[PDB]
Amino acid sequence: YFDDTLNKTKIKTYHSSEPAYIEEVNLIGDESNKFQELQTVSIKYRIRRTPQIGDKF
Amino acid sequence: TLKYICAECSSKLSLSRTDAVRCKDCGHRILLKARTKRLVQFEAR
Amino acid sequence: GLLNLGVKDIGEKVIFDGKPLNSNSGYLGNKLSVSVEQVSIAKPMSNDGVSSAVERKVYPSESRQRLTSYRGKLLLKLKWSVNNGEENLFEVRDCGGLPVMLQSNRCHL
Amino acid sequence: MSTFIRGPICGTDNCPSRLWRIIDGRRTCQYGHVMEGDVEFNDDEDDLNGLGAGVITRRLNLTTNATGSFQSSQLTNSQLLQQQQRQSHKKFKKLIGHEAKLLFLKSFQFILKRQIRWLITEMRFPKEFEHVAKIIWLKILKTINDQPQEELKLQLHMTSTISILYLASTHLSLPVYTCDYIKWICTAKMPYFQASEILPKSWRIQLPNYYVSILEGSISPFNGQLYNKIALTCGMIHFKEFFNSEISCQGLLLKLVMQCALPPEFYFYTKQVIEFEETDIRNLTLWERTDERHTGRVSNHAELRVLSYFMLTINWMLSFDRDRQYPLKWILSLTESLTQRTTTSESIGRNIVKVVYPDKPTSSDYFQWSEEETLEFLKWMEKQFLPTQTSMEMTIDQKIARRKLYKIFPLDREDSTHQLTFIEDLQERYAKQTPFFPPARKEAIGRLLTHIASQLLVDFAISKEQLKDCISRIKNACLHR
Amino acid sequence: MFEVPITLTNRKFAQRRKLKYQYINYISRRFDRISKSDEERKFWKKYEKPEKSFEIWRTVSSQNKQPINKQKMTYHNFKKIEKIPLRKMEIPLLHCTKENKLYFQSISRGLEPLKTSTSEVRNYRTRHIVTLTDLLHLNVSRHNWSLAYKIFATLIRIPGVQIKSLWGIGVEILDNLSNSSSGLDFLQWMCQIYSSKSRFVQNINYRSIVPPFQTGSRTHTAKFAITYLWSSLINCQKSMEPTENDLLQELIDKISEWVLTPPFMEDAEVWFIYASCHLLKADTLSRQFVNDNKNNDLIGLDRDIKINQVIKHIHYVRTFLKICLDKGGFAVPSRLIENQLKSFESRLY
Ligand SMILES: [Zn+2]
């Protein structure tokens, strides 16, 4: 995204110990009166969990 | 053409930084980001 | 329903403009009866761009995807009784969105 | 460029780069070495019962932990934001004055040109029609520049453009005015009535500074309105000196006789009275450049006088046809057959012009509107009113709503060639009179003359008396035998 | 001749209304005494509104109020009140156009204008439209379905339609149009296009949207929404009792989505036709369990679960008819509906 105040293109980084995959990204304009800027985004991450030593059964 | 699907009308569309975040065929305010033909490698395990 | 019996039991809340009228004063400067007659709950609706935006029935899936509450407009018929009945005023006031139970007699599903 | 350092640089090696190892908690040298700080703060544990009303809250005036050593910024004054928003809500028009006038000028420039090319397609009148029209306005422009400084009285008017095309056509002398006007209204041949076209999208917006918006047919011509500006344009133009044989046309006479009681003789009758005292045996030319702003009964609107001679001829001729060449019962038959009737395009057009609902001469036909006339009317509305237009914004919602509404009433369609052609109708009514071979006839003659008065007057600026004022005028002119 | 789709060329009419009111508050004032833009808003704050209907018709059968006022009008007494308001109208009369000078001097003499303001506007946009509006009204006055529909369909595509006739000729044209559409659809599209559940009225100079034939939701019953429900129950009746059904339920749940707000919040037809749709749902179920004891020889068919489903309803509908009476509803001739319902409950025996 880009903030005019900083004149810089910034990004929100993902911070985790393990990778995932983005399953769905949903754009939320709802409850808005105008909101033309598309300010809310929902990103769902898929983290696979393979059976592993220490996982409970 | 980037794509955005209406969560409630199924209508494909391609919003721009210059248009309202709304389903142009229904009027919904929720849009699913469409998947594209994008290469991804996978380890088969 | 239970909620309308509750509002019939809370009854009235009386207030006197401080008796004035200059027995005028002592014998109250007119009675101002107030109360709530009925209470209605409506199924979730959303009109956009305010008035002039055909309303749509709102389904839970939208409330979840939007990550927002699933509210029903709560209305209650207000009774503004003046001089114990010299003048009666009704107004149904909109009291914001009451969260509705799913599969209840007030949810679309 | 900007500089590095607005926080730290490695005073060891002269390497001004910085690394973040979030796993380390360490700020380090991106290129070289060492600890840029051992201390690392604020990533709390599992204990934030949140009693803290923490009223503080950042607001960018106490700076920030600077946790980005990456920087570039700039000097700021203090929250561009208002200047940012001023700049976002700047690009509009906010002009006015000479600059606004120039584009007002420009737009006027363009629509006329669009007008001219439909002109060519409709009439197929080669380079010629096109180039004469161009220099005509080149000449018109010449004058506008001179009284410039800050003079903003450019006349033009919805009328000026057709006056321009009119005068140019007369130079060439292709047609007529009433016919041209009716044809144009009927087929919207001109882009005249709506000014949204251009390709302004933008000229539209250039807050055409009061000017431009005033574009767009604004309204339909009254009494004078349109012959008056033609005179102004001529004075503007000094048109008569420049162009030959203006206002002329033996074709308007033909148009007129065929117009109705087309008499294989009244063309020559009226041509003869015109021959007579009608400007001493001479094709009357375009009136002059009525320089004066009062624009009085110039009346020498050549045509206006042609129609006057036309009318006069009819009753003179017909109310002293001593030989009785035109039978009593013959006159009413013509006025008879005349009664309304469809039109291979023409009469339908004249209905469309009648619908400017003016002085109520056609208002009632408004009412009557002979069945189908009603139908072919709605036909011409579903074809030529569509341009009509295209709320911008006001909800990509209502646009949608509007669309839905239209869908709902879907309107349209939930020997052939019925509307025969012009010379077909013309033929069939001169056949409808083809049985040719006191107080009452005088009455019939008056009856008939009122009708033509309706017709000729209706195509034009009328003056339910100037017309006759006009009539009166030459009446007077005549009796100097 | 008919009523035009558009905001009235706001040019001379707005300054004629200044001069009219300003005179009425001036002559107004000296009477009030003869008894001891903003002016126009003050005239309505002094006179008041009409309510959601048309003409403040209200009985005339309660309050005596002795109006003897007595000929109190001696030509001499009128010219005492009038001699000073007219000289104060002149001031503003000079700044007004020559046409509006005598327009004022006509209405101040008591002359009325035979010059319909909608008989002079000369705007391409406008004009035509008046052209149209009159065409479609002369075509429904001879039932010309195939041509009235074309003129109607063009009239709304031109930028000058406020529901207006757009709905009041848009419904019959669809009843007279034996072909495509049930004013219903169009009626339900209107309902959503004019809920305006906003409570308001009064305040500003309603001078392009006066008509209690568009507007409402927050008091002022809309009449196309009441017509939508009435046309919908008549659309349910035809060829019922003569899972693709639902309609008499669709109408029970569409009127329930309401439940007081603006509609029931307001009383009548709302409650009444709700009951009427409900009363029809009780008859159909007596027919579907009527003829010669239900269908015929008895029911054995597990007692009568169907009688209990119907008696519950009959008891309910009597609750809806009663609350519609209690809450001031003059609409219902209770005597006939109670006799019908008892003679019907009989059939159920
Ligand atoms: Zn949709």
Swiss-Prot record, chain B:
Going by the UniProt record, its keywords in alphabetical order are:
DNA-directed RNA polymerase, Metal-binding, Nucleus, Peroxisome, Ribosome biogenesis, Transcription, Zinc, Zinc-finger
PTM per UniProt? Answer: The N-terminus is blocked.
Which is an annotated GO molecular function term of this record? Answer: DNA binding
Q: Where in the cell is it found?
A: Nucleus, Nucleolus; Peroxisome
**Can you cite an annotated GO cellular component?**
RNA polymerase I complex
Residues in C4-type zinc fingers run: 6-26
Question: Taxonomically, which superkingdom?
Answer: Eukaryota
Question: Which GO terms are recorded in the biological process aspect for this UniProt protein?
Answer: nucleolar large rRNA transcription by RNA polymerase I; ribosome biogenesis; RNA-templated transcription; termination of RNA polymerase I transcription; termination of RNA polymerase III transcription; transcription by RNA polymerase I; transcription by RNA polymerase II; transcription by RNA polymerase III
Coiled coil regions in record = none
Q: Where does Zn(2+) bind?
A: C6, C9, C23, C26
Which family does this protein fall into? Belongs to the archaeal Rpo12/eukaryotic RPC10 RNA polymerase subunit family.
This protein's assembly is summarised as: Component of the RNA polymerase I (Pol I), RNA polymerase II (Pol II) and RNA polymerase III (Pol III) complexes. Component of the RNA polymerase I (Pol I) complex consisting of 14 subunits: RPA135, RPA190, RPC40, RPA14, RPB5, RPO26, RPA43, RPB8, RPA12, RPB10, RPC19, RPC10, RPA49 and RPA34. The complex is composed of a horseshoe-shaped core containing ten subunits (RPA135, RPA190, RPB5, RPO26, RPB8, RPB10, RPC10, RPA12, RPC19 and RPC40) where RPA135 and RPA190 form the DNA-binding cleft.
Other comment: Present with 907 molecules/cell in log phase SD medium.
The protein in question is named DNA-directed RNA polymerases I, II, and III subunit RPABC4
Q: Which gene name belongs to this protein?
A: RPC10
Swiss-Prot record, chain C:
Q: Note the superkingdom of the native organism.
A: Eukaryota
Localization:
Nucleus, Nucleolus
Q: Where are the transmembrane segments?
A: none
Q: How does it assemble?
A: Component of the RNA polymerase I (Pol I) complex consisting of 14 subunits: RPA135, RPA190, RPC40, RPA14, RPB5, RPO26, RPA43, RPB8, RPA12, RPB10, RPC19, RPC10, RPA49 and RPA34. The complex is composed of a horseshoe-shaped core containing ten subunits (RPA135, RPA190, RPB5, RPO26, RPB8, RPB10, RPC10, RPA12, RPC19 and RPC40) where RPA135 and RPA190 form the DNA-binding cleft. Outside of the core, RPA14 and RPA43 form the stalk that mediates interactions with transcription initiation factors and newly synthesized RNA.
Q: Which family is this protein grouped under?
A: Belongs to the RNA polymerase beta chain family.
The task this protein performs is described as: DNA-dependent RNA polymerases catalyze the transcription of DNA into RNA using the four ribonucleoside triphosphates as substrates. Component of RNA polymerase I (Pol I) which synthesizes ribosomal RNA precursors. Besides, RNA polymerase I has intrinsic RNA cleavage activity. RPA190 and RPA135 both contribute to the polymerase catalytic activity and together form the Pol I active center. In addition, subunit RPA12 contributes a catalytic zinc ribbon that is required for RNA cleavage by Pol I.
This chain belongs to which protein, by name?
A: DNA-directed RNA polymerase I subunit RPA135
- Lineage of the organism: Eukaryota, Fungi, Dikarya, Ascomycota, Saccharomycotina
Q: Which residues of the full protein are shown?
A: 59 to 172 of 1203
Swiss-Prot record, chain D:
Q: Where are the zinc fingers (RRN7-type)?
A: 3-36
| Miscellaneous comment text of the record | Present with 398 molecules/cell in log phase SD medium.
GO MF entry, a single one: RNA polymerase I core promoter sequence-specific DNA binding
Q: Where is this region: C-terminal cyclin fold?
A: 211-320
* Membrane-crossing segments per the record: none
Q: Where is this region: B-linker?
A: 67-101
Q: Which residues form a coiled coil?
A: none
**Name of the protein:** RNA polymerase I-specific transcription initiation factor RRN7
How changing C29A affects the protein?
Impaired binding to Pol I
What does the UniProt entry state concerning the protein's domains? Although it shares weak sequence similarity with SUA7/TFIIB, displays a similar subdomain organization as SUA7/TFIIB, with a N-terminal zinc finger, a connecting region (composed of B-reader and B-linker regions), followed by 2 cyclin folds.
The Swiss-Prot or TrEMBL record describes its family as follows: Belongs to the RRN7/TAF1B family.
The cellular component terms of Gene Ontology attached to this UniProt record, alphabetical and capped at eight, are:
nucleolus; nucleus; RNA polymerase I core factor complex
Report the protein's function: Component of RNA polymerase I core factor complex (CF) that acts as a SUA7/TFIIB-like factor and plays a key role in multiple steps during transcription initiation such as pre-initiation complex (PIC) assembly and postpolymerase recruitment events in polymerase I (Pol I) transcription. Binds rDNA promoters and plays a role in Pol I recruitment. After binding of UAF (upstream activation factor) to an upstream element of the promoter, CF is recruited in a SPT15/TBP-dependent manner to form a pre-initiation complex.
Query: Which Pfam families does this UniProt record tie to the protein?
Result: Rrn7_cyclin_C, Rrn7_cyclin_N, Zn_ribbon_RRN7
Quote the record's binding site residues for Zn(2+).
Answer: C10, C15, C29, H33
**InterPro entries, sorted:** Rrn7_cyclin_C, Rrn7_cyclin_N, TAF1B/Rrn7, TF_Rrn7_Zf
Q: Does the keyword Oxidoreductase apply?
A: no
Span list, region N-terminal cyclin fold? 102-210
Protein location? Nucleus, Nucleolus
Q: Where is this region: B-reader?
A: 37-66
Main subcellular location: nucleus
Curated annotation (Swiss-Prot), chain E:
Enumerate the InterPro entries for this protein. Answer: RNA_pol_I-specific_init_factor (IPR053029), TIF_Rrn11 (IPR007224), TIF_Rrn11_budding_yeast (IPR016850)
One GO BP annotation is: nucleolar large rRNA transcription by RNA polymerase I
Provide the alphabetized UniProt keywords: Nucleus, Transcription, Transcription regulation
GO molecular-function annotation terms? RNA polymerase I core promoter sequence-specific DNA binding; RNA polymerase I general transcription initiation factor activity; TBP-class protein binding
**Pfam family name, one:** Rrn11
Give the superkingdom in one word: Eukaryota
Q: Does the keyword Transmembrane apply?
A: no
Where does this polypeptide localize? Answer: Nucleus, Nucleolus
GO CC annotations on file: nucleolus; nucleus; RNA polymerase I core factor complex
The question of whether Transcription is a record keyword is answered with yes
Q: What is its main location?
A: nucleus
Q: What function is annotated for this protein?
A: Acts as a component of the core factor (CF) complex which is essential for the initiation of rDNA transcription by RNA polymerase I. After binding of UAF (upstream activation factor) to an upstream element of the promoter, CF is recruited in a SPT15/TBP-dependent manner to form a preinitiation complex.
Subunit field text: Component of the core factor (CF) complex, which consists of RRN6, RRN7 and RRN11. The CF heterotrimer may further dimerize to form a hexamer. RRN11 interacts with RRN6, RRN7 and SPT15.
Q: What does the further note read?
A: Present with 476 molecules/cell in log phase SD medium.
Protein name as catalogued: RNA polymerase I-specific transcription initiation factor RRN11
Please name the gene that encodes this protein.
RRN11
